[PDB]
Amino acid sequence: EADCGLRPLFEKKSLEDKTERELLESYIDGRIVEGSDAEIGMSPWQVMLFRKSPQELLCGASLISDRWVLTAAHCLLYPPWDKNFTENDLLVRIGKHSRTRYERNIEKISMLEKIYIHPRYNWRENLDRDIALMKLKKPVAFSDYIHPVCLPDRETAASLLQAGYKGRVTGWGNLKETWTANVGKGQPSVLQVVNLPIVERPVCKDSTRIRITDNMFCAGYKPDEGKRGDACEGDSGGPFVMKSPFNNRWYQMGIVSWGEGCDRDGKYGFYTHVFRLKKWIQKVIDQFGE
């Protein structure tokens, strides 16, 4: 996709969002608070996966072209929970800011032609190769509020996905809503944003009893320096993104995966490693698109 990762309301208008410079500088401030309301059009690739009947937010997702949405396999297929969705059970909403309000003349509703799950998706032991693509029935029309994110190439993945560099989780707290012991505060009313440092692989592994695959990375602050930035502000199967200092473009480096780690805030967020699985993604796009 030629235009990917340049937002109409930012890169295309020479405007910057409130925290992108802190990402590009990999700066971690002394401040405690991180997880705030997003600016309109800050995340124009942001997608909601909704159940047809009754209407409910199942998951997050991301727009990668006019016909292609990316999410987590577990959003579509989780036999232990009796979760098994067809194209027909689902729609997506693209361009949203408000969690609850129907945003007439801004948001678009699409149906799915087809669902594709990584043939080596494993829900049994750990959530390995937790990735899926959804083909829209009809191409969606890009707008100020609807624009695709880039997927990384080999050099962008090596360059951006490194311990101590800073990436971005956007969503409507659907991960929190799914996994929260108690619903204390309610779900956010507007799109949330949080910037999270990528964690050393060995620190990730020691943090959990889940067998951490190389198909996964993790991000978040040490409990030691207590921060209010919460991954659970993210949506299950939603985007983890980074800005390239080389071409000024937003790349999706991760998918919000399994969110059992969410419950006690001494753990980190676990993300599917997009570039690791790009051969499958590109094969599906090349062979089952146009």
Assigned domain for 222 exists: yes
- 200 and 267 part of one domain: yes
Regarding whether 219 and 257 lie in a shared domain, the answer is yes
In a domain, 138, yes or no: yes
Is 110 designated active site? no
The reply to whether 218 and 177 lie within a common domain is yes
Classify residue 13: in a domain, yes or no: no
Same domain assignment for residues 132 and 191 = no
Polymer length in residues for the chain = 290
Question: 116: which strand partners?
Answer: 133
Looking at the DSSP bridge assignments, the partners of residue 269 are 219
> Considering its fold, how many domains does the chain have in total?
2
Catalytic residue among 97, 110, 118, 130: 130
Give dist(CA 43, CA 160) in Å, integer: 19
Q: Is 25 helix (H, G, I), strand (E, B) or coil?
A: helix
Sheet of 68-71, strands arranged across: 108-110, 90-94, 46-51, 56-63, 68-71, 132-136, 112-117
Whether 29 is catalytic is no
Query: Is 3 noted as a catalytic residue in this protein?
Result: no
Closest CA relative to residue 59, chosen from 73, 45, 44, 75:
75
Q: Are residues 93 and 180 in the same domain?
A: no
283 contacts: CB under 8 Å, gap ≥ 6 = none
SS3 281: helix
Examine the domain organization and report whether 203 and 222 are in the same domain.
Answer: yes
Strand partners, 240: 169, 254
Q: Is residue 239 part of a domain?
A: yes
What is the span of the domain harbouring residue 122?
Answer: 46-146+278-288
Task: Answer yes or no: is 11 within a domain.
Answer: no
Q: Which long-range contacts (CB under 8 A, 24 or more apart) does 154-157 make?
A: 154/275, 156/244, 156/246, 156/251, 156/275, 157/253, 157/274, 157/275
Beta-carbon contacts of residue 241 (< 8 Å; ≥ 6 apart): 43, 45, 149, 167, 168, 170, 250, 251, 252, 253
Regarding whether 158 and 133 lie in a shared domain, the answer is: no
- On whether both 124 and 161 belong to a single domain, the answer is no
From the candidates 110, 207, 236, 257, give the one annotated as an active-site residue. Answer: 236
Same domain, 209 and 240: yes
Strand partners, 242: 251
Question: Cβ atoms within 10 A of the Cβ of 243, count?
Answer: 22
Obtained via which technique? X-ray
Q: Are residues 60 and 141 in the same domain?
A: yes
8 inside domain: no
**Do the beta carbons of residue 180 and residue 86 sit within 8 Å?**
no
Q: In CATH, what number is assigned to the domain containing residue 126?
A: 2.40.10.10
Handedness of CA 240, 264, 179, 74 (dihedral sign): positive
Q: Which of 129, 76, 111, 74 is nearest to 281 (CA)?
A: 129
- Our CA angle for 217, 184, 174, nearest 5°, is 40
Domain-embedded: residue 183: yes
Instruction: Say if residues 131 and 61 touch (Cβ distance below 8 Å).
Output: no
Euclidean distance between CA atoms 101 and 124, whole angstroms: 37
Q: Which of 62, 65, 74, 110 is catalytic?
A: 74
Nearest by Cα to 219 from 160, 266, 164: 164
Q: Are 242 and 273 in contact (CB under 8 A)?
A: no
If asked whether residues 97 and 129 sit together in one domain, one would say: yes
Q: What is the resolution of this structure in A?
A: 2.1
Q: Note whether 27 and 161 are same-domain residues.
A: yes
Residues 6+ positions from 209 with CB-CB distance below 8 Å: none
Q: Which two tokens stand for residue 251?
A: 């790349």
